[PDB]
C-alpha cells in the first residue's frame, strides 16, 4: 500500500523542483546542495516487539526527531512541502521493509 507513496510524493517533489528551477534557474547545490529548507537528516531507531519478534521502529528528520531547518531557497517552502514531504513516506517504507524482513 505504501509503495504508491513513493510515486505520489516523488511526482510532487518533481513538480516542486520544476517550479524552483523555473523560479531561480540552476540551484546553488555544491556547498549546501540547495533544493530544500528542511531535512537535516538524522535517524533514530526504536525496537518494538510483536509476537516475540523485535520489530525495529525508525524515526528521522522531517519524519520524527533530530530535524532542523534554516532559510531555504526561493521555492524552498514548496520544495520542503514536496521534496521534504516524501521523507515521512520514505521512513514509513523503510520501517515496513525492516519489519517485513525481521518477520520473514
Amino acid at each position: 500500500t505504501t509503495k504508491e507513496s513513493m510515486g505520489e510524493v516523488m511526482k510532487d517533489s518533481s513538480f516542486a523542483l520544476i517550479e524552483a528551477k523555473y523560479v531561480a534557474g540552476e540551484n546553488i547545490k555544491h556547498i549546501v546542495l540547495e533544493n530544500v529548507q528542511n531535512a537535516s537528516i538524522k535517524v533514530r531507531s526504536r525496537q518494538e516487539n510483536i509476537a516475540g519478534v523485535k520489530i525495529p521502529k525508525f524515526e528521522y528528520f522531517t519524519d520524527g526527531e533530530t530535524k532542523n531547518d534554516l532559510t531555504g531557497l526561493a521555492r524552498g517552502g514548496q520544495q520542503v512541502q514536496q521534496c521534504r514531504a516524501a521523507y515521512v513516506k520514505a521512513i514509513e517504507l523503510l520501517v515496513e521493509l525492516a519489519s517485513l524482513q525481521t518477520s520473514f
Binding site: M6, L33, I41, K42, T62, Q79, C83, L93, L94
Partner: protein
C-alpha cells in the same frame, strides 16, 4: 543514525538531504556526491560500503534500480537495518521490477 542515497538524480536527493544540518549523512567525513549517471553503481556499492556498511547510514535509495546492480544489491538482506534500500520514482518509474529489496519482496 544517518540516511542518504548519494547515488541519485542530484537535486531529487538534495531536496531531502541537507538544508538545516547533518551535511547529508555527514559529508564532512562520509556520504558522496548525490549526482548519478557519471558511472555504474559499482562506485555506489563502494559508497554503501563506505556509508551504509560504516554503521552510520541506515536507509539508502537507488532510483528505480536503473543501474543499481539489482543482483549485487539484493545481497543486502543480511543486516537489513544498516542496508534499508529504497527505489525512488521521478525521472525513472518506481516498479516492482528487479532491485535490491523489492526483488526479495517479489518472492
Amino acid at each position: 543514525s544517518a540516511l542518504i542515497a548519494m547515488i541519485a538524480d542530484e537535486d531529487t536527493v538534495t531536496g531531502f538531504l541537507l538544508a538545516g544540518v547533518g551535511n547529508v549523512d555527514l559529508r564532512r567525513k562520509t556520504n558522496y556526491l548525490i549526482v548519478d549517471s557519471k558511472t555504474t553503481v559499482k562506485a555506489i556499492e563502494d559508497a554503501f560500503k563506505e556509508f551504509t556498511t560504516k554503521e552510520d547510514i541506515a536507509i539508502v535509495l537507488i532510483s528505480q534500480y536503473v543501474a543499481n546492480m539489482i543482483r549485487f544489491l539484493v545481497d543486502s538482506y543480511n543486516k537489513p537495518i544498516p542496508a534499508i534500500l529504497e527505489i525512488p520514482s521521478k525521472d525513472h518509474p518506481y516498479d516492482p521490477a528487479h532491485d535490491s529489496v523489492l526483488s526479495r519482496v517479489k518472492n
